[PDB]
mmCIF file of C-alpha atoms and ligand atoms in Angstrom:
data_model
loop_
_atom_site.group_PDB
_atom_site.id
_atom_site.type_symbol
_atom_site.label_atom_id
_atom_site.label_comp_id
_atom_site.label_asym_id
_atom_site.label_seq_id
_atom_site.Cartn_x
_atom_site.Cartn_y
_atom_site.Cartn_z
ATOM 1 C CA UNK A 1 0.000 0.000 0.000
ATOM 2 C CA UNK A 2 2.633 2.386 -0.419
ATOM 3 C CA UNK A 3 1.498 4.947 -3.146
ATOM 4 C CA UNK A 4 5.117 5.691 -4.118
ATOM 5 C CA UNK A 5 6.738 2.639 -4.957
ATOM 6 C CA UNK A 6 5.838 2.645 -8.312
ATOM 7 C CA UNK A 7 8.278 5.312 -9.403
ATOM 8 C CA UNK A 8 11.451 3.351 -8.303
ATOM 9 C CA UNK A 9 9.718 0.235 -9.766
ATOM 10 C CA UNK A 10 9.625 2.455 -13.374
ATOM 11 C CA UNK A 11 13.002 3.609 -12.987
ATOM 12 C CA UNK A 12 14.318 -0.282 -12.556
ATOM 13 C CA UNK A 13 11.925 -1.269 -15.592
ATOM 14 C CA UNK A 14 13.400 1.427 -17.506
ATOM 15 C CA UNK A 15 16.832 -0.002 -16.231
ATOM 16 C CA UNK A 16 16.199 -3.100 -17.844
ATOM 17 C CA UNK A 17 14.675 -1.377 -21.088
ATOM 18 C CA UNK A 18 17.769 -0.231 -21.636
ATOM 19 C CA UNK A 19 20.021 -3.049 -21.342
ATOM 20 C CA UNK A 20 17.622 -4.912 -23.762
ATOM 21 C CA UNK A 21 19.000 -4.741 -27.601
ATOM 22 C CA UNK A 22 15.234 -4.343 -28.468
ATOM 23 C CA UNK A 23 14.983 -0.974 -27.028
ATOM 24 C CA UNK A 24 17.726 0.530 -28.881
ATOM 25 C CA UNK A 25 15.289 2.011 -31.826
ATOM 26 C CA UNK A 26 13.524 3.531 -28.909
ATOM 27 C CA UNK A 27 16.208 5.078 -26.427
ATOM 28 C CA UNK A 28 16.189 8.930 -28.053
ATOM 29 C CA UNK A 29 13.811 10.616 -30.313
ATOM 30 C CA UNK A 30 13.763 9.230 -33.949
ATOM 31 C CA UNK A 31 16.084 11.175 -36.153
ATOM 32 C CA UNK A 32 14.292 13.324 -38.921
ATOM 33 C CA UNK A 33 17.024 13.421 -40.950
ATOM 34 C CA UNK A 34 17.335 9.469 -40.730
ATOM 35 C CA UNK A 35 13.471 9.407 -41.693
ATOM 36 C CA UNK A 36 12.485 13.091 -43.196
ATOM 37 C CA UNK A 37 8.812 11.682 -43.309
ATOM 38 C CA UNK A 38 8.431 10.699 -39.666
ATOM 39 C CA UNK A 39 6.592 13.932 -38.368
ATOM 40 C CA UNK A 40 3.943 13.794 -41.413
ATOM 41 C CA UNK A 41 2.715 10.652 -40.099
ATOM 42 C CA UNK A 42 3.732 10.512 -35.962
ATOM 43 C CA UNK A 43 1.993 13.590 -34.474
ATOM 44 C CA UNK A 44 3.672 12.960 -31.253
ATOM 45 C CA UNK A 45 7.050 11.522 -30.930
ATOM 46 C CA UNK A 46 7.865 9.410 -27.936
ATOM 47 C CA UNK A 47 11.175 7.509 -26.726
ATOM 48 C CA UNK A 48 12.541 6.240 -23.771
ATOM 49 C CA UNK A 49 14.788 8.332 -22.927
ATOM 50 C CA UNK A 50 11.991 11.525 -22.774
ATOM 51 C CA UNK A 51 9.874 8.689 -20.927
ATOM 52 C CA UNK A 52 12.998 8.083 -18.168
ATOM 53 C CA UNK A 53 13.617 12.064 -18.370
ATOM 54 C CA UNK A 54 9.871 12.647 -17.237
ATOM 55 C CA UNK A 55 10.133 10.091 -14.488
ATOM 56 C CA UNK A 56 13.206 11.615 -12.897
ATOM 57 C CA UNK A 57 11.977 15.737 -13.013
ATOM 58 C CA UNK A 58 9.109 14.598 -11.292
ATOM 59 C CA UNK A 59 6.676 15.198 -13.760
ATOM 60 C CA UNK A 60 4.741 12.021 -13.976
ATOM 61 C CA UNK A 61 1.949 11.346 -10.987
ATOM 62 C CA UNK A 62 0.794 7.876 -11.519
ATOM 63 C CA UNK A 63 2.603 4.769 -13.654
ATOM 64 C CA UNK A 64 -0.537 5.287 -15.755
ATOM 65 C CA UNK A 65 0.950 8.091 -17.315
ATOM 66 C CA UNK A 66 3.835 6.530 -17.735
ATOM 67 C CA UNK A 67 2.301 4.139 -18.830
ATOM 68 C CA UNK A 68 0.479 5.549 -22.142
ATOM 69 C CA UNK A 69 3.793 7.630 -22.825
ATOM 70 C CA UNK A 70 5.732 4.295 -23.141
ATOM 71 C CA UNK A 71 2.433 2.933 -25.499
ATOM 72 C CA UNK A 72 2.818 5.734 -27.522
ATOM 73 C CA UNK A 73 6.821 4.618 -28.281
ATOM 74 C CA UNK A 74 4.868 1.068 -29.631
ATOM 75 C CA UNK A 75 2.216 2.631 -31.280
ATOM 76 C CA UNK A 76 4.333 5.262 -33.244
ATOM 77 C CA UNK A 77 6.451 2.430 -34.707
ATOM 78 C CA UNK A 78 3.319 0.304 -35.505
ATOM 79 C CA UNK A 79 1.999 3.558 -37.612
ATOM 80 C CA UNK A 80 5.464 4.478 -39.033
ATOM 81 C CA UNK A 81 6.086 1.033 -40.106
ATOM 82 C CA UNK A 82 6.044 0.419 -43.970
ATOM 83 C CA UNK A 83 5.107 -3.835 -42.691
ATOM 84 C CA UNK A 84 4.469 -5.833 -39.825
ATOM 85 C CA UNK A 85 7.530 -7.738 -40.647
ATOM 86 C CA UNK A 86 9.829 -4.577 -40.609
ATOM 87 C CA UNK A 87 13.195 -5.247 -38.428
ATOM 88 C CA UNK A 88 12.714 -1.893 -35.742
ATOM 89 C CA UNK A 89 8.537 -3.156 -35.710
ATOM 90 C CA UNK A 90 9.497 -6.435 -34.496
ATOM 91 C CA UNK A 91 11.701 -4.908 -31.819
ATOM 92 C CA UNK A 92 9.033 -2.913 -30.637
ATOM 93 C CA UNK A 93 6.494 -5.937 -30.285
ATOM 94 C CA UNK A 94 9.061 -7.880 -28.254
ATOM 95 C CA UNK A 95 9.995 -5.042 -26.302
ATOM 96 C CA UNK A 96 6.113 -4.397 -25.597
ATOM 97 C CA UNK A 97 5.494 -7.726 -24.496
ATOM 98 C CA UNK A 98 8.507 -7.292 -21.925
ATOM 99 C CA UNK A 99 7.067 -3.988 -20.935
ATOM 100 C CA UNK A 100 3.452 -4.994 -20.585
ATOM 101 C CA UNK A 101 4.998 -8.362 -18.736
ATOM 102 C CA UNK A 102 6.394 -6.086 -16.053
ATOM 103 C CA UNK A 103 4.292 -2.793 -15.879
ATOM 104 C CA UNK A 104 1.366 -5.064 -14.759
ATOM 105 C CA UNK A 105 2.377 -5.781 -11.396
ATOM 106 C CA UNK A 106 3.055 -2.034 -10.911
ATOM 107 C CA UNK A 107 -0.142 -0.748 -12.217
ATOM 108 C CA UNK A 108 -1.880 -3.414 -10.129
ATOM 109 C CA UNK A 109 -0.140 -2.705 -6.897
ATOM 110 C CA UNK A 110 -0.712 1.367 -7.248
ATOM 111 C CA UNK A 111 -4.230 1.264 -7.906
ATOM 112 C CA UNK A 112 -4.410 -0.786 -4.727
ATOM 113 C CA UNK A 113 -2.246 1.151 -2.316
ATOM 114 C CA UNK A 114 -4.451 4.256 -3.952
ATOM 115 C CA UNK A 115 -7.738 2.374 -3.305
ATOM 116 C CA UNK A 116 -6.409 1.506 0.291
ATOM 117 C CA UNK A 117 -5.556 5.382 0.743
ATOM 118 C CA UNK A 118 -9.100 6.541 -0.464
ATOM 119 C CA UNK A 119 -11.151 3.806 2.005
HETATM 120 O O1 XZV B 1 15.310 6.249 -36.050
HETATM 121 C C1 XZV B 1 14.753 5.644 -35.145
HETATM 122 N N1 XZV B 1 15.311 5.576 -33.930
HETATM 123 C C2 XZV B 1 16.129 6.659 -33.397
HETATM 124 C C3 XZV B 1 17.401 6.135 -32.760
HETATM 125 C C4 XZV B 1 18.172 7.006 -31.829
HETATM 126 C C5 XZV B 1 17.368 5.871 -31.297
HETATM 127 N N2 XZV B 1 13.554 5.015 -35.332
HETATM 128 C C6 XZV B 1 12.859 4.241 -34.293
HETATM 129 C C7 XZV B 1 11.362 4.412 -34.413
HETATM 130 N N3 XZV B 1 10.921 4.069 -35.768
HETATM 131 C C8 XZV B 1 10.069 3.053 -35.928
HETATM 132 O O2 XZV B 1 9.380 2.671 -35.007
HETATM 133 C C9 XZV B 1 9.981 2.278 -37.190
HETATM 134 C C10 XZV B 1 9.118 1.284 -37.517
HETATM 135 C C11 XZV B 1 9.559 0.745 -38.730
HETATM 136 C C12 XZV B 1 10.644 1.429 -39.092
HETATM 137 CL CL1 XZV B 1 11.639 1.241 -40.352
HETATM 138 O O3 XZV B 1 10.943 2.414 -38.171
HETATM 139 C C13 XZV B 1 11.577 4.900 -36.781
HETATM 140 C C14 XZV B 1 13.077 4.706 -36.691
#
């Protein structure tokens, strides 16, 4: 029931983001130059790095947030890719299935130190 654990728990889950080859797409914000079309399709870039940046200035209040911003990395490279089959599309769906593997526990255990708060 402690309402703050989560934000160490996202901190050691971005830990192990980042030691995993399959986040290496994903670590800083995708560079235009690299891809000149990538803002005419991705309204809102997202990486891990701005993700872990967030977390650490303080400026997320719930792992939900985190949450959707960390979505939003998998869902830009599902809309930017030109096939499911694409090399950095496959490294986001393993690297979402690791995320969603682990962020579970932490979403579950907030919303219950938060329900125990509110009782
Ligand atoms: O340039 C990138 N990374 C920046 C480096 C510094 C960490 N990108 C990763 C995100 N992208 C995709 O999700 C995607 C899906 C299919 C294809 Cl191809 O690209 C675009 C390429």
């Amino acid at each position: 029931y402690d309402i703050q654990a989560w934000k160490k728990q996202c901190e050691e889950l971005l830990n192990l983001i980042f030691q995993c080859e399959d986040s290496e797409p994903f670590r800083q914000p995708v560079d235009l130059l690299e891809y000149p079309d990538y803002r005419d399709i991705i309204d809102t870039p997202m990486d891990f790095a701005t993700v872990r940046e967030t977390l650490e200035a303080g400026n997320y209040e719930s792992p939900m947030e985190l949450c959707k911003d960390v979505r939003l990395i998998f869902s830009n490279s599902k809309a930017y890719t030109p096939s499911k089959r694409s090399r950095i599309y496959s490294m986001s769906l393993r690297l979402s299935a690791f995320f969603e593997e682990h962020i579970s526990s932490v979403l579950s255990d907030y919303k219950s130190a938060l329900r125990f708060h509110k009782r």
